[PDB]
Structure 1
């Protein structure tokens, strides 16, 4: 009645709507995780270089799991500035720069954009537009020495500041005054480099602290470094949606005997429609079939005569029907599945054509 937009319906068959089997769950599969970036050799190194000679490492073309760095509670300071860390597993850049050094406890706050200090102006300067993260953790038990560890040196005097991403290890004698010095200190000449005095007896803010800064670069070369992609289990004989290595689509997955050459990944038959796919984990050839769908029709003998109808699903096997899930005796025909009309074994004239050589009429509906 709603489709016809009328309050009366004459005898006949009318197409009302269509139905389709809904997907049950979702599955995503990806190749086995490998080629992890060597993060262990950086955060578990035997020693770190001086602050004025900060060590630089390049990371490219490897998967980097930042979750292990996030969930570790041994990092006293873990400050990521450019973006929220939780989404680095999804979005990523093309290169990583790691800068490692050792500074004092009070100098931890100096490693940030818009910050000033001895280290921030003479040892390592970061631009206000810097993006990345900084990890600082205490290393008192290792770097600090009972006799005084002077192995770490920092610049103290310089005429000008340091440009962003600039490393200077020059040992030129700083000349505060106007009297030139020929490599020897004097009244107005002092050594810009001073050795640290880290000791176990030193209090909080004086203990040595290892700092590693990670910066992300997005040069026009393709991005290669970011977190792994999780995978799920595999199911069969159920219309579900799949995301096989970027190939996304719905359907039912069965086993196939087709043979693939060892360099393909998926196949198609004609008109560029996917037909079979190979899972990247177990390397077997599956088969994709669109799960059943089709229009529905209502057969009625006229509103004036009676008020009961029959429902026909066109081209749908009588195995997946779903309030009219049981109704009357269910009949399976070549045209489709019929519900609400009983099947007789006589033969009369045709009144309301159904198809495949059969049709129904009102006596109930037969």
Structure 2
């Protein structure tokens, strides 16, 4: 979509992988603000609303927290210290054509600065003078709407880079989705610590003759003693019991 008609789609109930972005070897503005790109994988907040729009190469600097300008003030304003990341890449091979790609529009004028995280969709014309315009172009109408023009011969500083904006904030909505956690390797016959999804403990593997039910994550036997778990990785049952101990 265009800059003035940026969409906002929430990503939730599924795991979002940011590792593939690091080795994509295609982005040119892989910059993160307010958080390191690596450390936001394991931990993250909800409200993963993604904003997608088209920004010209020279207009990249305009789109940044605490930075004002033309696009940042009349099309989409990023709040200062915005906790998010911006990833941009060249789109000349697809978002360009000979003679100008007249498909992305933007707002050139506005009476007041845009509120951060606001989408402006209106046909209202700029009113700098006192006499309004009745639909006929004159000396004070100045139709703000204009069409971007991108060509394959555009300079590197003017190339249209396809960029998206990710927002991260913690609201009352629970059950946020973050990056996946790498699984360790199996270890057999050793008093080893284990930390499953929610619970952790120490013990060793020992043979058992009793099968556990398949619709429980963990179980206990006596005196709130958790001694049974069910790995969901492959549903392969493994027996875990506290390892031997005693006095000398």
Of 125, 132, 140, 2:92 maps to 140
CA shift for structure 1 position 120:
0.4
Find the aligned partners of 1:189 and 1:266 in 2 and give their Cα distance.
70
Q: What displacement does 1:126 show?
A: 0.9
Q: Which has more radius of gyration?
A: 1
In 2, the alpha carbon distance for the partners of 1:146 and 1:116 equals 31
Give a deviation string over 1:183-208, Cα, whole Å, max 9, x none: 22211111101111211122122221
Hey, what's the Cα distance between the residues in 1 that align with 2:97 and 2:54?
Answer: 14
Unaligned runs of 5+ in 2: none
| Cα separation, 2, equivalents of 1:282 and 1:142 | 42
Does the 8 Å CA contact 2:66/2:81 hold for their aligned counterparts? no
Corresponding pairs, count: 248
**C-alpha RMSD of the superposition:** 2.0
Over 3 Å counting, the alpha-carbon distance change for 1:54 and 1:275 in structure 2 is closer
Q: 1:231: Cα distance to partner?
A: 1.3
| Shift in Å, 1:61 | 1.3
Residue number in structure 1 paired with 2:80: 128
Aligned 8 A contact 1:63 1:224 in 2:
no
Counterpart contact for 2:33–2:81, Cα < 8 Å: no
Cα distance in 1, alignment partners of residues 108 and 97 from structure 2: 22
Deviation at 1:245, TM superposition (A): 2.4
Decide whether the 8 Å contact of 2:87 with 2:165 is kept in 1: yes
Post-superposition shift, 1:175? 2.4
User: Deviations 1:24-75 (Å, cap 9, x if unpaired)?
Assistant: xxxxxxxxxxxxxxxxxxxxxxxxx111111222111110111111222210
Structure 1 pair 274–213 and aligned structure 2 pair: CA distance change class (3 A) = same
- The answer as to 2:135 corresponding to 1:183 is yes
Residue 98 of structure 2 aligns to a residue in which SS? coil
Task: Write the distance in 2 (CA, Å) between the matches of 1:142 and 1:107.
Answer: 19
TM-score normalized by the length of structure 2: 0.93
Paired residues of 1:106 and 1:205 also in contact (CA < 8 A): yes
Provide Cα deviations, 1:196-224, integer angstroms capped at 9, x if missing partner.
12111221222212110011131112132
- Structure number with higher strand proportion: 1
In the alignment, the residues of structure 1 paired with residue 187 and residue 153 of structure 2 have an alpha-carbon distance, to the nearest angstrom, of 62
- Residue 284 of structure 1 deviates from its aligned partner by 4.2
Alpha-carbon contact 1:62-1:224 (below 8 Å) kept: no
Structure 1 counterpart SS, 2:206 = strand
User: TM-score, normalized by length of structure 1?
Assistant: 0.64
